[PDB]
Amino acid sequence: ATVESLTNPGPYTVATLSEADGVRNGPKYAGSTIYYPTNATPPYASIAIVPGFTAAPSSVQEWGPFYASHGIVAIIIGTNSLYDQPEARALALLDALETIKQENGRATSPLIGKLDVTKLAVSGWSMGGGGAQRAAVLDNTISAVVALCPYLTSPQLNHTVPVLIFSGQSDPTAPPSQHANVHYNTTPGTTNKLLFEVKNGNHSVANSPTGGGGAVGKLALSWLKIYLEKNDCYCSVLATAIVNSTTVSSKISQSYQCNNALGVVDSKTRFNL
Ligand SMILES: [K+]
Ligand SMILES: [K+]
Ligand SMILES: [K+]
Ligand SMILES: [K+]
Numbered sequence: 190a191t192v193e194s195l196t197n198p199g200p201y202t203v204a205t206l207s208e209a210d211g212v213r214n215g216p217k218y219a220g221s222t223i224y225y226p227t228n229a230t231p232p233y234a235s236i237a238i239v240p241g242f243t244a245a246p247s248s249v250q251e252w253g254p255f256y257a258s259h260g261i262v263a264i265i266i267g268t269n270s271l272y273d274q275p276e277a278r279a280l281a282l283l284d285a286l287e288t289i290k291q292e293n294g295r296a297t298s299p300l301i302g303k304l305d306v307t308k309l310a311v312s313g314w315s316m317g318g319g320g321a322q323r324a325a326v327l328d329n330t331i332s333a334v335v336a337l338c339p340y341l342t343s344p345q346l347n348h349t350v351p352v353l354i355f356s357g358q359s360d361p362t363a364p365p366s367q368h369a370n371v372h373y374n375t376t377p378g379t380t381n382k383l384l385f386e387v388k389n390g391n392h393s394v395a396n397s398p399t400g401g402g403g404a405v406g407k408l409a410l411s412w413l414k415i416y417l418e419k420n421d422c423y424c425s426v427l428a429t430a431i432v433n434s435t436t437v438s439s440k441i442s443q444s445y446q447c448n449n450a451l452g453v454v455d456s457k458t459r460f461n462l
Contacts, residue, residue, distance in 0.1 A: 190423070191426060198254075201226035201227070201257065202226065204227045207220070207222050208221060213291045215266070215285060215287065217277075217284035218239070218268055219269040220267040221285065223263070223264045223292070224254055224263040226261075233303060234262065235263070235286075235304060237266065237309070238311075239285070239312075239314070239321070240268070242268065246265045249265060249397070252312070252409075253265050255398045262300070268281060275339075276323055279324040282324045289306065290304075308332055308418065310333040310417045311331055313337060314337040314339075315362065316340045317337075319372075322344070322352060325346075329349060333413055336353070336355065338362075338363050339356075339369055340368055341368060346377075349377065351381035352380065352383075353409060354369050354372055354373055354382070355405055356368070356384070356390070357389075358440070360391060360392045365440070370384070370440075381445040383443050384440070384443075385404070385408055385441055386440035387405070387439070388438055388462070401434060407433075411427035424447040424448055424449040427447070428447075438460065439462050440461055
């Protein structure tokens with residue numbers, strides 16, 4: 190229940206599963222690795238993560254052990270090129286979530302009976318981060334979105350899913366003024382949302398929780414503890430992590446509501462260089 194609880198490595202032991210073990214082969218993506226805690230108390234929430242178009246899962250793979258070491262199952266999927274559009278990326282993520290849902294009943298799976306399939310999140314890089322936010326539109330029962338330097342040009346983001354957007358100030362591929370910032374502002378004002386731009390960060394800056402000197406992981410994990418796991422003890426943690434993280438940011442926009450130990454906080458603050 191403190192910003193110290195956001196340490197990389199968390200406390201749980203991490204193991205992995207894949208199609209090599211019998212995991213469902215989802216038709217809408219190319220390969221999965223499931224990172225899961227071996228010694229957390231069931232059930233576990235899950236997050237599905239997808240890299241940008243053409244990019245291999247190794248580009249975002251450090252999120253897997255990070256989230257799983259904190260009790261959150263992570264399914265990282267690859268792509269074979271299909272369509273150069275963030276909407277095929279949304280459907281890939283939804284198919285990854287179906288793989289998680291089936292995994293909860295898969296005979297011989299170490300995760301049989303251990304997944305809370307109503308606590309599902311999505312995350313993605315570049316067009317995968319546009320896809321993650323569109324996945325929330327297409328399936329508004331998803332519990333959180335973590336977008337990593339998202340790319341999506343003509344966004345309709347009509348959803349109520351708490352969404353955390355990371356961006357890179359120096360991102361040439363998905364420049365924040367044309368992407369992340371627009372995604373933040375077109376998401377409904379009543380939707381819980383948070384925008385964090387890494388000062389001088391390139392397009393890859395949120396590909397690992399170590400981005401922003403660790404700020405990326407601290408904010409992402411706090412966000413999921415609150416909105417995916419429904420653990421209000423992490424409301425004040427996120428707030429502290431945000432203040433602590435301003436040193437490495439060039440822009441923060443907050444518009445989210447959160448219950449702490451003493452009451453309700455409706456944060457709408459903005460930081461700019
Ligand atoms: K496949
Ligand atoms: K799979
Ligand atoms: K705050
Ligand atoms: K809001």
